[PDB]
Amino acid sequence: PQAGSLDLQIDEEQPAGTLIGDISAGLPAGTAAPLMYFISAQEGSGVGTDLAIDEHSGVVRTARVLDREQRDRYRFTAVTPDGATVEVTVRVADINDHAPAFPQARAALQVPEHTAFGTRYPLEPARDADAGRLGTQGYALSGDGAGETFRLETRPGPDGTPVPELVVTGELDRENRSHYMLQLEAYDGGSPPRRAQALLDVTLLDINDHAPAFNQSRYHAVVSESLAPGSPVLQVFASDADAGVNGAVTYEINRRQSEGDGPFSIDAHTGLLQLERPLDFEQRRVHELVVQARDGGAHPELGSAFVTVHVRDANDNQPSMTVIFLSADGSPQVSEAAPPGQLVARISVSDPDDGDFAHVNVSLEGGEGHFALSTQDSVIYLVCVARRLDREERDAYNLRVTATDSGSPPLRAEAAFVLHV
């Protein structure tokens, strides 16, 4: 033939002047020994400063320290003066010179709790500088909790370097296990495997899991009437095991479904139920309430509890009474000395009642003895005439009825009238 081809190889970062080969082996067998090897290489894509070639002998040696990280293979054609050509190719072999390394020695990851199984979280891989089998390779997770909750599945990323993806497995709830301290290890090819390690602080975020639960389902009280407005009634308790604003319990009181919540109000951040106006049993017998609590934050969860406040009465309402006169026109009058054993009015007693229903004793003032008092059924009273009402230098008599309440404290009620002839 009239041409030849030859391939060569050399290791990395070996000193300059190291032997590469001889162009003589690439020439066709039997051809004349040339006096000079004309070198033709791709300009700028080439030998330049990175090879030394002897033109008169054909030996090749390394011009400097050789790094295949920048340039892996060289190619150039040697031409003899006779016309024969030898296509030469020099390859730089790789040796583990750059060990793997992580950009973060102690990285931190944030993953929401209760996350779906199998969702993947990529991480920063240990970049391979020495390409080929010597970099790259595979990650191994050495952290605790990696057998049950956190596994590692490798995925090749850009340019083929492997990117670690921490997959989700098992249980994840910060209410029990707050955070994990994992450790990552990276190896590489070559009989002496270079290694790199880094720690990973995986923390679990919080979400609105638990609604505010109360101490007891329903509360109770037995406050009396006319209680001090500034006085307390009872304190409610509610808990929420979440963190941040999701653990803040703001106690409130439902205004719709609660019947009798008018006189009441609850402290916002202590659950202390306190009244604002005094209540009356002779108006409202019992108060039925529903309290709530908000799981503070975005879209709050809602808890609820019941409040039952019974009321027992006290004798504070004055006795009432009505009077109607039974003589002709309702207006008070009497005849000129009316017959005896005659009645001129009617009285009925009433009161807001607890204990003794009604049963009030009246105290009609005198009437100078010409009038008397009688009762029908201990509730309705009458007014009788005595002494014939002789009109002895007397025209009309100012009379008054006193309603005396039969309670523990004395409670009086006045009611005056004028009876004429």
């Binding site: 004309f38 791709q42 006779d82 479904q257 109607i324 309705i380």
Partner: protein, 425 residues
């Protein structure tokens, strides 16, 4: 001195209804005490009769005390009338239709306090708070009714317990109706509607329209042009549906618009720097706990002829200004080498032509395209004279994309170099 009677009468009866007969005394006329528009007494030893229809619910109090009258001593016997109900009112809720919100994907036990109906009638004829039923809307079987009654006689509460499995993406709303019945001789009914509007939670992540995106870009693309367009979607509603795109590795000379998803050229490109980019695109939703979807994006650069070719020579001496050849050089020996270097790829550079200019395109010595594609040989195809032509000024040409069809966009770009030859024996 102790006569007192009590009468009982029904409500919603036509006027003139006989209530009762007050006991009479011979020779006496009885009339009313105070004028009120409900009753009037027959004085001829008669009885007591109503004078108008009355609704018991319209009265301030049921029992009403009345006082009689008499002829001469005006002896008064008291009379009390009790009016009852007959259940002429039906149970009614404070509002016919309300709206309650439930948390989707929540476990069983989530409930909400609802309104309790009330009836204007008496106790026995009042609402039966244990007879609440949900008659329509719950055909799917999601909710149930739990009623909590109170130890106090005045009070009742109703709950709407959800048995879990609520999903907005499956069914975001339920319209329910409740049937309550008056606990009366006539069982009369009441109704309340519930607009159940569940709330959206971020349970679904963004998903791209395709798993692998491919696009070709010319390396002459100006800064700001479009590369490709990604598209994603989220099954949730509102804030949990707003997707923000981003390139997972924005160290590339590209840039991702976080809203439209249009990869743009952020820095000027070059084909000889890198062939193609194997990127990865993200899709992040604005939910309260954010989620992310991914897909690979491949961008291939397209080469254009933006680098010109050069020719460098290697002749008989090395460290020499000008080439030197012996005169007795036998015909057929190589003098120099025509090394044609081109950085651009052949896909955008076409066939390379080389011709002779300003020298000896005259068989003085031939040029030959060697077996190597780019390399050419400079030989001596004839024996010459030294005194006649002692030197040469041979230059050559080299063109990119030469021999192209007419109207081709791949215009040619050339560069010429020269090498001299001297005869020195």
């Amino acid at each position: 001195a102790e006569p007192r009677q009590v009468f009982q009468v029904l409500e919603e009866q036509p006027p003139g209804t006989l209530v009762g007969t007050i006991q009479t005394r011979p020779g006496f006329t009885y009339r009313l005490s105070e004028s009120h528009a409900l009753f009037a007494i027959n004085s001829s030893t008669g009885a007591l009769y109503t004078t108008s229809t009355i609704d018991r619910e319209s009265l301030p109090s049921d029992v009403i005390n009345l006082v009689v009258l008499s002829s001469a001593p005006t002896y008064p016997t008291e009379v009390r009338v009790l009016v009852r109900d007959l259940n002429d009112n039906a149970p009614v809720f404070p509002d016919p239709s309300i709206v309650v919100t439930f948390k989707e994907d929540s476990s069983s036990g989530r409930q909400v306090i609802l309104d309790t109906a009330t009836d204007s009638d008496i106790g026995s004829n009042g609402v039966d708070h244990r007879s609440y039923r949900i008659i329509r809307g719950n055909e799917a079987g999601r909710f149930r009714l739990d009623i909590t009654l109170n130890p106090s006689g005045e009070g009742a509460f109703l709950h709407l317990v959800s048995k879990g499995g609520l999903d907005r993406e499956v069914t975001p709303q339920y319209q329910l109706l409740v049937e309550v019945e008056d606990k009366g001789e006539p069982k009369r009914r009441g109704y309340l509607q519930v607009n159940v509007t569940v709330q959206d939670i971020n349970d679904n992540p963004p998903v791209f329209g395709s798993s692998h995106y491919q696009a070709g870009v010319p390396e002459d693309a100006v800064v700001g042009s479009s590369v490709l367009q990604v598209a994603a979607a989220d099954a949730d509603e509102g804030t949990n549906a707003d997707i923000r795109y981003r390139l997972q590795d924005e160290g590339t000379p590209f840039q991702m618009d976080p809203e439209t998803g249009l990869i743009t050229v952020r820095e000027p490109l070059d084909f000889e720097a890198r062939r193609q980019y194997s990127l990865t695109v993200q899709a992040m939703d604005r939910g309260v706990p954010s989620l992310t979807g991914r897909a690979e994006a491949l961008i291939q650069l397209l080469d254009v002829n933006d680098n010109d070719p050069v020719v460098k020579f290697r002749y008989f001496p090395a460290t020499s200004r000008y080439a030197s050849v012996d005169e007795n050089a036998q015909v057929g020996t190589v003098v120099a080498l025509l090394t044609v270097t081109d950085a651009d790829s052949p896909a955008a550079n076409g066939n390379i032509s080389v011709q002779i200019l300003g020298g000896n395109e005259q068989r003085h010595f031939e040029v030959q395209s060697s077996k190597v594609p780019n390399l050419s040989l400079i030989k001596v195809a004839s024996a010459l004279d030294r005194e006649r032509i002692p030197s040469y000024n041979l230059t050559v040409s080299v063109s990119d994309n030469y021999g192209a069809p007419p109207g081709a966009a791949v215009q040619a770009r050339s560069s010429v170099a020269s090498l001299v030859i001297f005869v020195n024996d």
